[PDB]
Design a binder for this molecule. Sequence first.
Ligand code: VEU
Length: 286
Amino acid sequence: RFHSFSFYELKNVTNNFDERPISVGGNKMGEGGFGVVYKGYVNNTTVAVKKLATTEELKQQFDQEIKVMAKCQHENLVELLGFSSDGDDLCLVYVYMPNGSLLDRLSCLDGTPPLSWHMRCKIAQGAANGINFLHENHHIHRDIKSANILLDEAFTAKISDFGLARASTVMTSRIVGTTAYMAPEALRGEITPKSDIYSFGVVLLEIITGLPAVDEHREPQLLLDIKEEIEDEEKTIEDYIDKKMNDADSTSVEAMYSVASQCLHEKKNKRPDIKKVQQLLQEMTA
Ligand SMILES: CC(C)Oc1nc2nc([C@]34CO[C@](C)(C3)C4)cn2cc1C(=O)Nc1cccn(C2CC2)c1=O
């Protein structure tokens, strides 16, 4: 049900893959670990075009993205419109997300207004609903992070990047992911949906605090260490709450923090499963 583009077609609608950032006059919107994401236009639809960038491993991920996207349709997952396998360079074409990534909105990149606490609650709920869909359908995402949660015009959260996804224990020799988000067992090469939960907990800390998961010029460098600072009585969650908010109440903030803390159990089998995380976040706003 996806459309088969040709590489030249996606080229001409992206200003010939103009790699300059959008803010500077080009078409580059961002980049990840596996390619460059370009803004484009086909017919009357604005689209995002990921031009993928070992070469054998890249092709397998490209095929996995299509396979997963074909079987996984949900309002909290990004939508694939088509692809281009013509020639050597591979492209995936997605529905455009007018509010970009959660990572960029939490940092207010390019001058966007800070996200309200009410919007942050709806985003956390939506991202949990998307992870719940993946796990119900026996997919492990393996790369949950704020850069992989995109936002549409109503700030509905949409999980992206299923190149590394796996069916759902199991150890692997190729260890992939973003270290500042990964569970300890994922860092050791275990593949388990329990690791998706841990990474989501880090995302919840980003939502609460507005801080990046890792910052070289901050103490602590790693966000997940603040749970230890709070736990050993040195600090409180209120000391870290994003100050770029005036609609956050301590009761629901602490409720979200409680979920993140539960997700961030170092021991995998003490973590809640995604259905419980889903319920806890629903109980937050009731
Ligand atoms: C996050 C980047 C890579 O992407 C974007 N960035 C965007 N920024 C803005 C603006 C507008 O005004 C600002 C001030 C700039 C915020 C909009 N915006 C849309 C996208 C976008 O649609 N990206 C994706 C769509 C589908 C899937 N994927 C994953 C699969 C690769 C995407 O990355």
